[model samples]
Target: CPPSTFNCNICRVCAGYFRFKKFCSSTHNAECECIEGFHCLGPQCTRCEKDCRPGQELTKQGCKTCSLGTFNDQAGTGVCRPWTNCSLDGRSVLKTGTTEKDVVCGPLV
Candidate 1:
C-alpha cells in the first residue's frame, strides 16, 4: 500500500508480519493471521512472534531450548514430551532419545 491519504482501520494497510486472510475492502479491514514459523503474539492476531524449533519450546523470553528430560519432535507451537523409558516398558532400548529425537523401543523379548 502506498502512502495513506485517509485514516480508517479498514483503509489502513496490514503489515508484512501479518498474513492477509481476507483482502481489505471498503467495508472491512484486512483479516489477518500469523505467518508460518510465527504465532499470534498480541491483540488482533496481527503480530507474528517466533515459533519454537524442533528442539525448543516457548518460554517467557520467546522460543527457548527444550528442557532436559523432555523432547520436542517437531517445530512450532507444540509442547515438549517426556522421553519414553523403554526399560520401564520392559522393552529394549533400540535407540537413545534426545531433545530433538524420540526413543526407539524394541519389542519385549
Candidate 2:
C-alpha cells in the first residue's frame, strides 16, 4: 500500500515517523512531503517568501507594486510614479501620468 498521512487507517500518526507538518511519502517511512507553501529553508520548513513585482519596493506588508490610488512604477521604486498631478476640480493641472500631488478636497464650484 502507498504510504499515507494516517499512521495506519486510524490516523493516530502525529508521532514518531509522522508529524503535523510532515506527510509520509509512499516511497518510504523515512521520506516525507512538506505542507503547502513551506520549504526546507533549514532545519525546519519555513514559509516561502512572496516576491515583489519587478521594480517595486517592499511596502507595509507583503510586496507591493503600487500604493493607494497611484499605479505603476519603475522596477524596485516606491517613488511617486508617472509625472502628473490634479486640481480640486478634478481637472489635470499637469500632463497625464502618475499623480505627483494630492487633489485637495474643498467647496465645489
Candidate 3:
C-alpha cells in the first residue's frame, strides 16, 4: 500500500541522532533509542539530551560542572582551563583564583 493509503508502523525516530529499525506490530513495535553520548527523554525515546564535555562531570540528570583545577569562564559548551597564577616575570596577583574565573594579574608599575 502507498504511504497516503494507510498508517504504517515504520516511522521516524522520536528525536535527533536516532536510528529507526524494524516495524511496529502488536507487542513488537519499532525500535527507537538514543545514540551514543545521548539519553532517551521519554518512553518513545524520541527526545534526548547530550552528555557532558570532555574531562567534565554530569549527573544522570542534566546538571554539569567543570573538572577540578580547571575553569570554564565563558558560557555554552566551552572547555575548562587551569587557573592563572601570573607566574611571568614582574607580574603581581591582583585577584585570587575561583572555580569559574581565573586569577587576575598585572605587570609591576
Candidate 4:
C-alpha cells in the first residue's frame, strides 16, 4: 500500500525516537512521536501534554497540563504522574501530594 493517510498520532517525538520494535503489523509498527518540544517517556511511548507545569504557560516549546485526573509528579520532569480515582462528576476526588512520586487518588467506593 502506498499510503492511506497520515492517521498517525501527530504528537510524535521523532522518527529516530519512534518505537521501531512495537509493530501492529509488518507494514505498520507502533509510532512514538511527540509534539515539537515534547518527547516520549519510556518504551510505552508515554506522552506529555502541552506545557504541563506549574509555572510554565502554554507555549510552542512546551506542552499543556496532563489530562484531568492525571498529574505530573516532579516539576521539570517530563514523566506523567499516574492517576487513580475518577469521580462520576468528572472530577478527581483524590488529592495530589506535594513531593510524592505517584499521584494516586483514593478508590471511589
Top lDDT hit: 1
Please give, for residues 1-109, the per-residue lDDT of candidate 4 as tens digits.
1233343432322353244334343354355555554455444555444334542234343545554544555454554444543555355646553322334455545
Among all windows of ten consecutive residues in candidate 4, which has the lowest summed lDDT?
Answer: 1-10
Per-residue lDDT of candidate 1, residues 1-109 (tens digit): 2224233443445567767777766555567777776777756664578787798887655677777878998877677889998889999888888888988999996
Candidate 3's C-alpha runs over 4 A off are: 1-9, 13-47, 50-64
TM values, all candidates:
0.59, 0.27, 0.44, 0.26
* Residue 83 displacement (Å), model 4: 1.5
* Clashing residue pairs found in predicted model 3: 14-46, 15-46
Q: Output the better candidate (2/4) by TM-score.
A: 2
CA lDDT of every candidate = 0.74, 0.40, 0.60, 0.45
Best-fitting candidate, scored by TM-score: 1
Query: Please, what are the lDDT tens digits per residue for candidate 3 over residues 20-69?
Result: 55544543446766677776665555566676555444444543676666
Worst 10 residues of 1 by lDDT: 1-10
Per-candidate Cα RMSD to the true structure, in Å, reads 4.3, 11.1, 7.5, 12.6
